[PDB]
Write a protein that binds this ligand. Sequence first.
Ligand SMILES: Nc1ncnc2c1ncn2[C@@H]1O[C@H](CSCC[C@H](N)C(=O)O)[C@@H](O)[C@H]1O
Length: 430
Amino acid sequence: SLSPAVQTFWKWLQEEGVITAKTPVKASVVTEGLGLVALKDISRNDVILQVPKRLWINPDAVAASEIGRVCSELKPWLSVILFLIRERSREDSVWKHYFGILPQETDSTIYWSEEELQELQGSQLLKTTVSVKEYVKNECLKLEQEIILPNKRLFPDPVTLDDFFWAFGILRSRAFSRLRNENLVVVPMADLINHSAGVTTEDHAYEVKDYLFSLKSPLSVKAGEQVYIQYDLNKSNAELALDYGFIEPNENRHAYTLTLEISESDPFFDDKLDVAESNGFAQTAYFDIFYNRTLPPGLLPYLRLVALGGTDAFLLESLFRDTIWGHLELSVSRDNEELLCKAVREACKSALAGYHTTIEQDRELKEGNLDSRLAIAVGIREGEKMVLQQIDGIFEQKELELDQLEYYQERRLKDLGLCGENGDILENLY
Ligand SMILES: Nc1ncnc2c1ncn2[C@@H]1O[C@H](CSCC[C@H](N)C(=O)O)[C@@H](O)[C@H]1O
């Protein structure tokens, strides 16, 4: 008892030369929706399935279609969305049966209702998803007026936001980008292999090799067990939440990104910006802070630069434009260190007060049964509160050790050599 549409999709892949007689993997209904359950014992690196470039849905595909003309300037994703939306309506679309399997929605925060989003109140994930929905919105209303509307012929039916977001979703939760020379590919078959924290090797279990999408199973899977792969070792839980409809219990995935910038209202803007760029940092810089990881290199120096101030402004002079970062890296002055510490700490406290539940309430909730979306909200907001508190702790410590640091002035007088020789003896020798 599988499914009708699934029944067809499985057939359509046989009638294309994709699923041969030797494919140790059938489709089945798993907890995570639809997945690929081994049809028999599989081993590490055992190729599971292969698809012909004939069936990709990448920018090259949209460029080789009727709309490739009008989308010539559009960024890659915008182009695929319109292509996806359009192909979706075409009764004669190549992916008629593949589109027949695509869930109309995932648990990504982009599809959450307003109530559902209140559960993420104060969370960065919220700020991020809001910010992303809007941008994707304006960029799609811009496509509606620049490409969609001006070409009513190519785009028959009307296109609503629910259509864009549907595509922006299918794209961001299924596209294999870790591929080489193809950084956005939609492969119908390998599109069913789900994620598992069990896979830890990563680095494309799939490979470009008619053409083919040879996807080799990273783990030894016994008969009847689902085949998995690692979606992304580096993404944070906030990212997994938005990109796919899930997060991991692993606290090491919890991250909170701080955004620093050298304000233009800063009286030394030009010089500071100069130093930042001379060392790889822009006017605005984002530092990702993960749970239990050491602060990102550069966060401190950049913070010290941002809080420089008139007193230590001499470090911006040409004299130091070669060691200034080394000094920022080491430390500038107690006044400067103390300042940045309060700024970071106040921001954490301020941020933490933005949430509507305590970490205790989130953890108690995790102890019961939560629907997919609430579970995601609770999990994410707990992690953020954890990182936020970790950061606050790291800097609360710095505030105490505010005198253990040997700042610029001290470092300068470290080489004074007061106790040398009685030089005056030689002075009189010439
Ligand atoms: N480990 C996991 N936990 C929860 N959902 C998962 C998951 N791995 C994959 N998914 C789901 O499947 C999507 C990836 S594409 C995989 C096919 C999908 N299961 C289907 O029924 O068509 C994700 O966006 C997510 O909604």
